[PDB]
Chain A
Amino acid sequence: ATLKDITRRLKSIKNIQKITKSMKMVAAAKYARAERELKPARVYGVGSLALYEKA
């Protein structure tokens, strides 16, 4: 399409590309945090059910 159209598109796509990308790290960071949070936690939940099992 006319260059505009392309741009228009593009514009957004680029944006997206950022936005998503942004969201990607943003998430990744959150995610990362969450990742951290798992250690004692891991145990902790694992623990949590850890007995309706034996008994």
Chain B
Amino acid sequence: TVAEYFRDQEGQDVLLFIDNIFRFTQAGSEVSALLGRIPSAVGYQPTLATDMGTMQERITTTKKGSITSVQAIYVPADDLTDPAPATTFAHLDATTVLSRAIAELGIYPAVDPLDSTSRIMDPNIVGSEHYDVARGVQKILQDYKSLQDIIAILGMDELSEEDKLTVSRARKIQRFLSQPFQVAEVFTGHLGKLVPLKETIKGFQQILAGEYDHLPEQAFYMVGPIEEAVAKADKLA
């Protein structure tokens, strides 16, 4: 209700942080029983969809401003078939699925890359340089997963070699996404390094170009733009 004021009235491009809608929904669900109502499967509140719907639809970009909605969604057991997230997606425009695995892979940004998506992306919209780089990236990495399966047989420095190159690249790529945090001296120690966009697209595009195919692999970890990663290799040796 407040934000709608600003949006329409104050025009504002609202950034709306919600942490977490999940708790709302959950709150709804909690009551559901006690509202006498049936809850739902997965415990929910039967009305969940509208609850959401009305809400999600409550907010938008009119031609009376925009509420840009940064909505934290706790995802229990990161289980997303977990009806709530399952629904959520419809109301999402860009889905950011943060991957605990990746987090575990030490990465910060710890994201789930392939599931942090926007159905939106396009070689038009984002330009193909963007798009394509991404599709290539998305591709290779998923394929790399296929390769993990190989590696399980074949080992830390033994495979089929082109494929090895790409593996290694994937290993760089991974690292290249890793990015410091100014806030988090506590998580990073580092201080944030921001990458202005082109430098990113290029960043990977270049990696894709394999221009560092002789550069160290984790000379990509916790960086800002790609140069600095190159720089970083030197800093080692």
* A residues at B contact (CB < 8 Å): 12, 15, 19, 23
Residue B153, interface by CB 8 Å: yes
How many A-B contacts are there with CB distance less than 8 Å?
6
Distance from B35 Cβ to chain A, minimum over Cβ atoms (Å): 30
Within 8 A of A (CB), among B140-185: 149-150, 153
Interface size class of B (residues with CB under 8 A): under 10
CA distance A45 to B122 in the complex (A): 63
Note all chain A residues with C-beta closer than 8 A to B153. Answer: 19, 23
Question: Would you give 6 A-B contacts (Cβ < 8 Å), ordered by A?
Answer: A12-B149, A15-B149, A19-B149, A19-B150, A19-B153, A23-B153
* B residues at A contact (CB < 8 Å): 149-150, 153
Note all chain B residues with C-beta closer than 8 A to A19. Answer: 149-150, 153
CA distance A15 to B150 in the complex (A): 10
Distance from B153 Cβ to chain A, minimum over Cβ atoms (Å): 7
CA distance A23 to B160 in the complex (A): 14
Distance from A55 Cβ to chain B, minimum over Cβ atoms (Å): 45
Distance from A5 Cβ to chain B, minimum over Cβ atoms (Å): 12
* Closest A-B pairs by Cβ, 6 of them: A15-B149, A19-B149, A19-B153, A12-B149, A19-B150, A23-B153
Distance from A27 Cβ to chain B, minimum over Cβ atoms (Å): 12
CA distance A47 to B153 in the complex (A): 38
Closest B residue to A4 by CB, please name it.
B79
Note all chain B residues with C-beta closer than 8 A to A23. Answer: 153
CA distance A12 to B150 in the complex (A): 11
